[model samples]
Target: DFDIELDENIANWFEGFRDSFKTFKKGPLISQRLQMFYMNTRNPYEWSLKLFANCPDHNSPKSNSLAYTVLEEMRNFKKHYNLGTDQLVDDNLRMVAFNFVAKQGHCLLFRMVVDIFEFLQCRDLFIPKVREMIARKQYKEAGQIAIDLELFEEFDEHDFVMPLFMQDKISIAEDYLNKAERLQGPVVQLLDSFFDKRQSVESHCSRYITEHEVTDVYYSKLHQKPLSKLVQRLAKNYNIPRQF
Candidate 1:
């Protein structure tokens, strides 16, 4: 029974919940302990993820750990965003972070990714990172980011293609259409015929991004050093928001 005395300080409550898992180290009712913990949090999603990331692996064969309790939730968890197709909100950062954690190289993100980025007006932020992957010939990551952005109402901006991994498809369609591509749409054809024959569309177009002015160290000494340098580098690499 959760009592008022047990409910004392909610801020430290999270750490206590984390510590409770330690109680199960001996044959651990890990699953039961995790369930008891889950029964208390308002945001079950975040807590389940936190435990999934931090807890010891549970197995009955080795030690009858309760790892089975929340382990299933972690494995089968799919985020459910409560928004219409046309709406955007803050919860998307959660969705983006979750998918990035669950990266399987080929899994396509929910289309909500495009809606959130479009709402944030930061496609320029993602384009470079996606390009970095593509530049390294790491199309698995490139395709992963690209295909999600393509769901942004079918706009054909060149930047949209790499994030959607359709570079070859786009090139194929354009080449197949060629100079003789302007067939008989009459007025459209007439307008195209009169268009400057020497003009180059690519001569001036670019993402035109400025250097990021803001910086963040996600793990400052205010907390403590992160356990892994990979997390440190990942923290540093993600601070790419440029001003309008």
Candidate 2:
């Protein structure tokens, strides 16, 4: 009813999504784009199932935040298309005729909910398999896989890293931490502390290590990690008396 039309692309996506239900993929993993599209809507498979639940739906359902924004715009002339709205509803879904879709869209969300369950099942399987990788002491690979599958968002760095740290695999943990640092800022900082601790152990033992050897003495001390063992041996290799 509003002359202020929804964008053509968004409108087309909504139509395409609605039409897709006739024969939809159930098992083939959903894409980030499609996943995002469902996430944006108040209800999937329906243009705006929430808007019409008060009709055939006895229980009144709340509308999508974006739909409410649209409704507000439809009410007042002040609304206009903008990038913020696009990002807020980043899937580019738009509703044209809610009155018609309301009736036809029923059960669409039900079927969609089932399919979404299938997608979530994969996420579920990945969680434990990833934990097992860490259990097997494959910290670096564990870290890499979890990050790859986008599981890092939910699995706290401390959660998995602690297991590796507790096992006294400081160097191995450091390796895992290094991988996490680019995505998670605090990782490198934590790794730095561990570096200090490991090198300190080497120093306490009074081990006359070259840069090559200190490379192996990562059990304690921090700043000592830089110089190659070749240089370390040449400078004070086994010369310093044990502090004891």
Candidate 3:
């Protein structure tokens, strides 16, 4: 029986809704709840995600199924607003949606988040959670998430493998690359750069990437640099049969 006019301000609107819910004996119907929120919201892209966040019964299994209904509606609005656009609109909303489901911890809505990210075709956005899972020793779960998200092809360009390269954990990174069969390009670059770094730091150099593996490759070839001292020594150490 609240008479307050909900405005575009999510914080104030949320506060009003929470206050009303606290006093009301029974909750509103799901459709009624969403419709009320939508009716007052001027920008669905900005507000709908928080409305979904606050939706009651959202913790229930049935709610996970019903989530598609709300999410699909939002997706339609997204397309309408950004008609024929290539980049994702309301990307912050997407981040909030993922964050909401993630904070619930063990909510089946995580799979829903995955589907949404995949639907949006943003493969990299999902990697932070995978990184978190890996750091928490949830390697198997992390790997499954990566597999489910079809992120293997993106690994070479992503932080997951690049940090390992920087830290000189070359074998682990190379092994992963070998498993995915993406070892050639980045591997060659790493060895070529490593050889150019110093001639005397042989103790720290990764044997996993042998001089033979780096044959005919040079850092200059990649970065468009001079074929001076760096490339000369790099070629000498790696025994690269240069085209020059």
Candidate 4:
């Protein structure tokens, strides 16, 4: 997580990038321009390496030059808008930018940076698996796996899009646990929903009986307590209001 100062700088950069994008008319060239803009506006070296690996042409002078020029224009735009570099360029911001490019059909670079971003964002475990799926172009499956694993659930999409690994993991987990098992559908679906909504299941479980004024009948039975007594006990333990 970035401190407040770095957060502000990244936010300003996003605004500038978005504003600059609005100037271009829709076409294939728009992707090229956007790639160039990303290269210059953020970390060029990293983005360049990823781009080059994806499309060998990215190594050519023409491609590199376009990327640099777009970046230069973005810098000027930032200055004109009074945007500052005080914002730190963190992994989250990088991921968001990668997702934007990927959605634009820049799969090579998107997959490359996405691999790096997942590792940086504490979901390194899924890197190899995601890479394999992506290589096969199993995008939907990949996305499902990522969603099931809760790998990048903590990341903010505005700053960092969910990594493909996280998407694929969650998707796979949901299909297997929720769809395949008839008995566990509700519970698994709830768990999947929790991650999909970027909420922690443990936190939700804890708060359900504490702050929400709700009772878990199953929990009461498991604890071998009467429903009314269980409710009172929950209130006492969590320091909440007792039922009437």
On a 0 to 1 TM-score scale, where does candidate 3 land against the true structure? 0.39
Highest TM-score model number: 3
Model 1, TM vs. native: 0.30
Q: Write the per-residue lDDT of candidate 3 for residues 1-244, one digit (tens) a residue.
A: 1112234574666645644553443234543554555556665544555445444534642443344445544554444445332353345555656655554444345565555444347757768766776556443345445555566675542333433443434444444554564544544465455455665323224343242232222222233233244335534544445433
Report each candidate's C-alpha RMSD, comma-separated, in the order given. Answer: 17.4, 18.4, 14.0, 18.0
Candidate 4 residue-wise lDDT, 1-244, digit = tens: 2222223564456545544564554445654565554546455434433333333233332323433233334443444455433344455555444433333333334444444343245455555555565455455444444444344442222111112212322333333333333323233333334334545544544454354233222342322123234334423533443223
Report the C-alpha lDDT of model 2 over 135-220, residue by residue, as the tens digit.
56455555544543445455555545544443444554444444443423443333334334556633523333332122223333
In model 4, which regions exceed 4 Å deviation? 3-25, 41-116, 119-121, 124-176, 179-244
Q: Sort every candidate by TM-score, greatest first.
A: 3, 1, 2, 4
Model 1: how far residue 41 lies from native, Å: 2.2
Clashes of each: 6, 17, 0, 24
Candidate 1 — which pairs collide?
30-66, 31-66, 31-69, 146-163, 146-164, 147-164
lDDT (Cα, 0-100) at 78 in candidate 1: 26
Q: Which ten residues in a row have the lowest lDDT in candidate 1?
A: 205-214
**Model 3 residue 5 lDDT score:** 28
Tell me the spans in candidate 3 whose CA falls farther than 4 Å from its real position: 1-40, 56-69, 72-91, 103-120, 139-141, 154-244
* TM-score of each predicted structure versus truth: 0.30, 0.26, 0.39, 0.25
How many backbone overlaps does candidate 4 show? 24
Say which candidate scores most in lDDT: 3
